[PDB]
RNA sequence: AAACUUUCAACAACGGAUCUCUUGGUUCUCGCAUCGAUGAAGAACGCAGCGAAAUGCGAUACGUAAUGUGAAUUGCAGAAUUCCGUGAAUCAUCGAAUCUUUGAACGCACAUUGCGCCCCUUGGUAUUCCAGGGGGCAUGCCUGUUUGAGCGUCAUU
RNA sequence: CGUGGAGGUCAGUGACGAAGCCUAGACCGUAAGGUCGGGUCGAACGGCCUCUAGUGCAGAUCUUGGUGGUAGUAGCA
RNA sequence: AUGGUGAA
RNA sequence: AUAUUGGCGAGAGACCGAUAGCGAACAAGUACAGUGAUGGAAAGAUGAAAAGAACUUUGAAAAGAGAGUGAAAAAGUACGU
RNA sequence: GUUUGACCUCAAAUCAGGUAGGAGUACCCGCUGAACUUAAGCAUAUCAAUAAGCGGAGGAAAAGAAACCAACCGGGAUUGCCUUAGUAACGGCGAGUGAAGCGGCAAAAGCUCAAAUUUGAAAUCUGGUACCUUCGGUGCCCGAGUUGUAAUUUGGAGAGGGCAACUUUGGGGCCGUUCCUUGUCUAUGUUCCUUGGAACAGGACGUCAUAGAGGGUGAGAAUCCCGUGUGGCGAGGAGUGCG
């Protein structure tokens, strides 16, 4: 009983919009019929079915936005990695590993050698 | 959460009694008009007691047990080094049993050596009372030839009747079980087969469980379908054990606490 | 003896871990041994228990009685074997809460992942 | 009122720290080759102790260069001076012996 | 505590980390010859004495060659640019081996390098070529 | 003598001591660094077939998707599941989602669930207007960008 | 002499009833207390050689909890 | 005394 | 290398064992009191399994009486001793 | 040219990209700062370079490569511990206050600017934009920047050249190891008897042990279940440590 996620992934924009209208109306029907019944099971399955359809729909918008912002500098804030605040500040891998030109020459000329001490 | 639990179930118990009996007051009112409706309740709804839910020859009569042919002589002895209460108990058996001789038992004469004497002196039964401490505890009836032998346990003795010299009438209750009617057989044999009707003395042997109660009473007949009876003689409770089959060599039943686990059966 | 520093021999930590275990961990904690016939066939000592498999009760008042598991009550750490039932005073039937360590499996319920579980543990179906 | 309950704990801490430094700096001897130095003040001048770093002079007399000395694990100090002759001799002998012992691996 | 009380109470769970065994048994990482010859049952200092190599170069506070030969085994085992080579061809064919004329030359030797610079580069050129 | 008062004993009451337990506390040690304008900590309003706190969650509301496990959940009622599989579960994991009203609180405001503005807009011919859907409009400061202003300075056959 | 816990020991005791609780019950110790019988109970506990301490109560207009006499009294406007 | 809350 | 009564996650104790131990082992910073800043408790244990006493009967209800489950109700949601 | 054009300055915008506030606060860094109390009343000594308040940080912070300590056959960044030591020293010499160098150890690591010209070529960087193998690279355009951005130098010196028939040499993937997270497999009685409701107890008879830690199971279970012990098979990540 209820919808399946993988089945809804193949569907179009209009088909999922149509499915959403069907499920929203069907749920509104059962809330009217709720007073007639002491027990009603389908009200739970439909609520979760609306939730599942909405998740697939919202996924399709977000993947479409990511496709139109394909590898360009400064894409929107709602698509960037959350991580934390401090890690969104603080120098990147490249920026931290960025060394002055003199130290790069001193690294080449005299690197930290590997040795053992006995025989 | 005791403080939550305490209020919730006290109220639920309070709620249930109201509902239980309001149902019953309506039951009472419908029963006033129609007597027939009450009748059907009693059929379906059963009290379901333990008794209701219990989990389910002529040559013998003479050969193992004493019949109405002789006076049976009963060799009443006591366990070695017994005190006042045992002889006090022997004085209660001196009245009730037919032809008792009390034998002061003086150390030795193991058991078979006793049997040799009571063959020569020609007794029928041996009865021995024992004491662990100051209270009486066990009673052992043996039949002298062949040896069907019954052991018993006493847990009750309390002492306003004061009886006559007239010989009491027997009565037994609930011996459906074959092991029950072999004990019923013992008390049919060991007690007198005289009943003199006048003197009005009755000895019972009621057995509704595995516990047997014996009492004495005085019965007065009024012609209005009823009889009165006063308490007389010793209060008593017995428990069957062993059925040693030989003089003391063999067993047939021997109580274990492996029973009581069933809550039923009743032998 | 404890050698690892990761594992704890504390009573307080261990009892809490058991009583506040999730349903998935309680599946493994409710394991039953197999009978000597199945141990000879499958080459495995013990498995977690499920519904549609048969069982024989070894220890308790219901000693030697057998049947088929109705429902694994994981919350109460219990199984409820059908036809191993205590009759109430009102004529109704209430199942006895048995524990799967006391049980012994006689006839398994082989599914696909169950077959894979046997094959993982060194089995030969 | 502080109590050092962690005397046993921090020794195990320090030992495991040396164990990690051994694991990461695999063939090398954890610490740098320190000099031999005469202690200051009339009270302690008889004592000869481990100094901080060598000198450019002691390093130059040994047969290696200052920048290269640090890469082979010789602690080099630049503010220390070579006033004493016996200390200078002892340190030069210490380095030359050390240079005979070392086996500096190729960069290929 | 205030915050810890919630974390024990919640159905979120705790970020359980078992990382106490790894703090002792540390794997060696920087040398393969050592990676084969290192008894983890032994300590640091005991492993060094077993190998031969010194664990400490100072006199230690307190109290107390199968592998080293294999290290000596691994101890047993630049061109010039196209323009530079072609430029040196121009100099050699013009003068020969007159380095004084070669450095006083203006047209071919533009960057006014010394005799020692030009001859060194010609020696390297004469190795790869004639 | 009974009753009455007192003393003792027995059996009931009252009370929760003692004993035993313990998903709690306290202290010591070890390891790690991890909140917030991408809107936190906190407050409020709600959400389950049937719920007080707690716990979870936000009109996708004691959850949705994903991954693993492999067949429950269970206080009660009631649905389910093809159970040789895209799959039961108040399961575990958790990276994708939604994320009400607020709160550093951020359109203007005071304590107004008021007072608005612009962009995008599906519908009611919508050329008038009417309604719906959705995202923005706080302050300071930096790097820019841009339309300017300035007898502020100079050039000008 | 006694109490909570620790090391050691008694291959100690213990669902055939540990600990506790009573008892017009018995014995020992000058005593602190120890031991035993009977009754009630339901799961751990004790002697011995040592260790350790939040260790022994009649009082503090003691703290907490419980229960009396006052009293079916003053009282309910 | 420090810091805060209230106030005919 | 050093500090650390917070946080995150462990491992422990010759520690305390429900008037102790954190104020809080439980609908605890809750109930509640204070205009407010703030102050702030009490309260753990049925059994192995609810098998939580069906059913008859006494009463409008409140509780009883028969009867039963359980090893024990001499364990009853007023629940171990 | 009574136009126009350079700059400098002040503006602007619901433009583009950012960022700061608040919570927590044991530790740390600053700022501010009482009183009860001690010597006899209290101005210092004394509570106290405290508590409260204020501001600011981090996994530590702070400190730190000498304008240092010393008086020696000199030491040699800083931090901490032991000791120096209750010493020197100060204190109506009294309540008392209270170091430091040396020595032993823990841990060890050093360097970057400003300074005289790249002047035979601003060699530098931001941003926008187009692609690419995207914690970034490249082309192109724009701006900053000569009121100085790069390379070279920091006293240990250093630079300019010349001589050595001097010596050395980058960077990117791939599969492993390693580190983090996570999954999975790995021994042996439910053998008899007694007692009890129940066996996990007593007794008899055996096995396993690199597993007789612990917890569960109807009472004290190595051998019933989960684990524990020794190993093995993986999955997903990190990564410059090296193979």
From Swiss-Prot, chain A:
<protein>
    <recommendedName>
        <fullName>Large ribosomal subunit protein uL29A</fullName>
    </recommendedName>
</protein>
<dbReference type="GO" id="GO:0003735">
    <property type="term" value="F:structural constituent of ribosome"/>
</dbReference>
<comment type="similarity">
    <text>Belongs to the universal ribosomal protein uL29 family.</text>
</comment>
<dbReference type="GO" id="GO:0022625">
    <property type="term" value="C:cytosolic large ribosomal subunit"/>
</dbReference>
<dbReference type="InterPro" id="IPR036049">
    <property type="entry name" value="Ribosomal_uL29_sf"/>
</dbReference>
<feature type="modified residue" description="Phosphoserine">
    <location>
        <position position="49"/>
    </location>
</feature>
<feature type="modified residue" description="Phosphoserine">
    <location>
        <position position="12"/>
    </location>
</feature>
<keyword id="KW-0963">Cytoplasm</keyword>
<keyword id="KW-0689">Ribosomal protein</keyword>
<dbReference type="GO" id="GO:0003729">
    <property type="term" value="F:mRNA binding"/>
</dbReference>
<dbReference type="GO" id="GO:0002181">
    <property type="term" value="P:cytoplasmic translation"/>
</dbReference>
<dbReference type="InterPro" id="IPR001854">
    <property type="entry name" value="Ribosomal_uL29"/>
</dbReference>
UniProtKB/Swiss-Prot annotation, chain B:
<keyword id="KW-0690">Ribosome biogenesis</keyword>
<keyword id="KW-0694">RNA-binding</keyword>
<feature type="domain" description="Brix">
    <location>
        <begin position="72"/>
        <end position="249"/>
    </location>
</feature>
<dbReference type="Pfam" id="PF04427">
    <property type="entry name" value="Brix"/>
</dbReference>
<comment type="function">
    <text>Essential protein. Required for biogenesis of the 60S ribosomal subunit.</text>
</comment>
<dbReference type="GO" id="GO:0000466">
    <property type="term" value="P:maturation of 5.8S rRNA from tricistronic rRNA transcript (SSU-rRNA, 5.8S rRNA, LSU-rRNA)"/>
</dbReference>
<dbReference type="GO" id="GO:0042134">
    <property type="term" value="F:rRNA primary transcript binding"/>
</dbReference>
<keyword id="KW-0698">rRNA processing</keyword>
<protein>
    <recommendedName>
        <fullName>Ribosome production factor 1</fullName>
    </recommendedName>
</protein>
<dbReference type="GO" id="GO:0000460">
    <property type="term" value="P:maturation of 5.8S rRNA"/>
</dbReference>
<dbReference type="GO" id="GO:0000055">
    <property type="term" value="P:ribosomal large subunit export from nucleus"/>
</dbReference>
<keyword id="KW-0539">Nucleus</keyword>
From Swiss-Prot, chain D:
<dbReference type="GO" id="GO:0003723">
    <property type="term" value="F:RNA binding"/>
</dbReference>
<keyword id="KW-0687">Ribonucleoprotein</keyword>
<keyword id="KW-0689">Ribosomal protein</keyword>
<comment type="subunit">
    <text>Component of the large ribosomal subunit (LSU). Mature yeast ribosomes consist of a small (40S) and a large (60S) subunit. The 40S small subunit contains 1 molecule of ribosomal RNA (18S rRNA) and 33 different proteins (encoded by 57 genes). The large 60S subunit contains 3 rRNA molecules (25S, 5.8S and 5S rRNA) and 46 different proteins (encoded by 81 genes).</text>
</comment>
<dbReference type="GO" id="GO:0003735">
    <property type="term" value="F:structural constituent of ribosome"/>
</dbReference>
<dbReference type="GO" id="GO:0005829">
    <property type="term" value="C:cytosol"/>
</dbReference>
<dbReference type="GO" id="GO:0002181">
    <property type="term" value="P:cytoplasmic translation"/>
</dbReference>
<keyword id="KW-0597">Phosphoprotein</keyword>
<keyword id="KW-0963">Cytoplasm</keyword>
<protein>
    <recommendedName>
        <fullName>Large ribosomal subunit protein eL13A</fullName>
    </recommendedName>
</protein>
<comment type="function">
    <text>Component of the ribosome, a large ribonucleoprotein complex responsible for the synthesis of proteins in the cell. The small ribosomal subunit (SSU) binds messenger RNAs (mRNAs) and translates the encoded message by selecting cognate aminoacyl-transfer RNA (tRNA) molecules. The large subunit (LSU) contains the ribosomal catalytic site termed the peptidyl transferase center (PTC), which catalyzes the formation of peptide bonds, thereby polymerizing the amino acids delivered by tRNAs into a polypeptide chain.</text>
</comment>
<dbReference type="GO" id="GO:0022625">
    <property type="term" value="C:cytosolic large ribosomal subunit"/>
</dbReference>
Swiss-Prot record, chain E:
<keyword id="KW-0539">Nucleus</keyword>
<keyword id="KW-0698">rRNA processing</keyword>
<dbReference type="GO" id="GO:0005634">
    <property type="term" value="C:nucleus"/>
</dbReference>
<protein>
    <recommendedName>
        <fullName>Nucleolar protein 16</fullName>
    </recommendedName>
</protein>
<feature type="compositionally biased region" description="Basic residues">
    <location>
        <begin position="15"/>
        <end position="25"/>
    </location>
</feature>
<dbReference type="GO" id="GO:0005730">
    <property type="term" value="C:nucleolus"/>
</dbReference>
<dbReference type="GO" id="GO:0030687">
    <property type="term" value="C:preribosome, large subunit precursor"/>
</dbReference>
<keyword id="KW-0597">Phosphoprotein</keyword>
<dbReference type="InterPro" id="IPR019002">
    <property type="entry name" value="Ribosome_biogenesis_Nop16"/>
</dbReference>
<dbReference type="GO" id="GO:0042273">
    <property type="term" value="P:ribosomal large subunit biogenesis"/>
</dbReference>
<dbReference type="GO" id="GO:0006364">
    <property type="term" value="P:rRNA processing"/>
</dbReference>
<feature type="modified residue" description="Phosphoserine">
    <location>
        <position position="79"/>
    </location>
</feature>
């Amino acid at each position: 009983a209820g919808v399946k996620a993988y089945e809804l992934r193949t569907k179009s924009k209009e088909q999922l919009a149509s499915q959403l209208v069907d499920l929203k109306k069907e749920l509104a029907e059962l809330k009217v019929q709720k007073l007639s019944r002491p027990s009603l099971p389908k009200i739970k399955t439909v609520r979760k079915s609306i939730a599942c359809v909405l998740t697939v729909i919202n996924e399709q918008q977000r993947e479409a936005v990511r496709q139109l912002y394909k590898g360009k500098k400064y894409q929107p804030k709602d698509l960037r990695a959350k991580k934390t605040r401090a890690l969104r500040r603080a120098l990147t891998k490249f920026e931290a590993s960025q060394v002055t030109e003199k130290q790069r020459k001193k690294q080449i000329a005299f690197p930290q050698r590997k040795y053992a001490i006995k025989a | 959460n005791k403080l939550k639990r305490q209020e919730i179930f006290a109220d639920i118990k309070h709620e249930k009694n109201k509902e239980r009996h309001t149902m019953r007051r309506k039951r009472a009112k419908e029963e006033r008009e129609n007597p027939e409706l009450r009748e059907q309740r009693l059929k379906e709804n059963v009290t379901q007691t333990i008794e209701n839910t219990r989990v389910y020859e002529d040559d013998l009569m003479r050969y193992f047990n004493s019949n109405s042919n002789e006076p049976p002589k009963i060799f009443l002895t006591t366990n070695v080094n017994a005190k006042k209460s045992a002889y006090e108990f022997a004085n209660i058996l001196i009245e009730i049993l037919p032809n008792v001789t009390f034998v002061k038992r003086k150390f030795g004469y193991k058991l078979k050596e006793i049997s040799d004497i009571c063959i020569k002196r020609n007794f029928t039964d041996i009865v021995i009372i024992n004491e662990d401490k100051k209270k009486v505890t066990g009673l052992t009836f043996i039949h002298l030839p062949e040896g069907p032998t019954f052991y018993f346990k006493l847990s009750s003795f309390v002492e306003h009747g004061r009886p006559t010299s007239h010989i009491p009438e027997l009565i037994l209750n609930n011996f459906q079980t074959r092991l029950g009617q072999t004990v019923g057989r013992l008390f049919q044999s060991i007690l007198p087969q005289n009943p003199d009707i006048e003197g009005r003395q009755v000895i019972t042997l009621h057995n509704q469980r595995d516990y047997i109660f014996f009492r004495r009473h005085r019965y007065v007949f009024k012609d209005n379908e009823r009889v009165g009876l006063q308490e007389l003689g010793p209060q008593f409770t017995l428990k069957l054990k062993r059925l040693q089959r030989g003089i003391k060599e063999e067993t047939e039943w021997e109580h274990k606490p492996e029973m009581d686990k069933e809550k039923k059966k009743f032998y | 003896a404890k050698q690892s520093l990761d594992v704890s021999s504390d009573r307080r930590k261990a009892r809490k871990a058991y009583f506040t275990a999730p349903s998935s961990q309680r599946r493994v904690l409710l394991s039953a041994p197999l009978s000597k016939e199945l141990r000879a066939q499958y080459g495995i000592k013990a498995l977690p228990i499920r519904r549609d498999d048969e069982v024989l009760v070894v220890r308790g008042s219901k000693k030697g009685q057998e049947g088929k598991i109705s429902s694994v009550y994981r919350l109460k750490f219990a199984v409820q074997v059908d036809k191993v039932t205590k009759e109430k005073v009102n004529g109704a039937s209430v199942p006895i809460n048995l524990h799967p360590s006391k049980l012994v499996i006689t006839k398994l319920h082989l599914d696909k992942d169950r077959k894979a579980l046997i094959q993982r543990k060194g089995g030969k179906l | 009122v502080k109590v050092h309950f962690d005397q046993a704990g921090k020794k195990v801490s320090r030992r495991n720290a040396r164990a990690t430094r051994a694991a990461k700096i695999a063939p090398r001897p954890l610490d740098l080759l320190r000099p031999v130095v005469r202690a200051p003040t009339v009270k302690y001048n008889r004592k000869v102790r481990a100094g901080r770093g060598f000198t450019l002079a002691e390093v130059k007399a040994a047969g290696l260069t200052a920048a290269y000395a640090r890469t082979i694990g010789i602690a080099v100090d630049h503010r220390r001076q070579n006033r004493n002759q016996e200390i200078f001799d002892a340190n030069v002998q210490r380095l030359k012996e050390y240079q005979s012992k070392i086996i500096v691996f190729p960069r290929n | 505590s205030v915050r810890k009380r919630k974390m024990n109470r919640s159905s979120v769970g705790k970020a359980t980390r078992r990382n106490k065994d790894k703090q002792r048994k540390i794997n060696i990482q920087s040398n393969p010859i050592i990676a084969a010859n290192w008894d983890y049952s032994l300590t640091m200092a005991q492993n060094y004495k077993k190998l031969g190599l010194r664990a400490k170069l100072q006199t230690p506070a307190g109290g107390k060659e199968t592998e080293v030969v294999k290290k000596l085994e691994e101890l047993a085992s630049r061109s010039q640019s196209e323009r530079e080579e072609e430029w040196l061809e121009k100099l050699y064919k013009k003068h020969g081996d007159d380095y004084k004329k070669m450095f006083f030359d203006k047209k071919l030797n533009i960057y006014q390098q010394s005799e020692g610079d030009l001859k060194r580069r010609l020696l390297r050129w004469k190795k790869r070529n004639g």
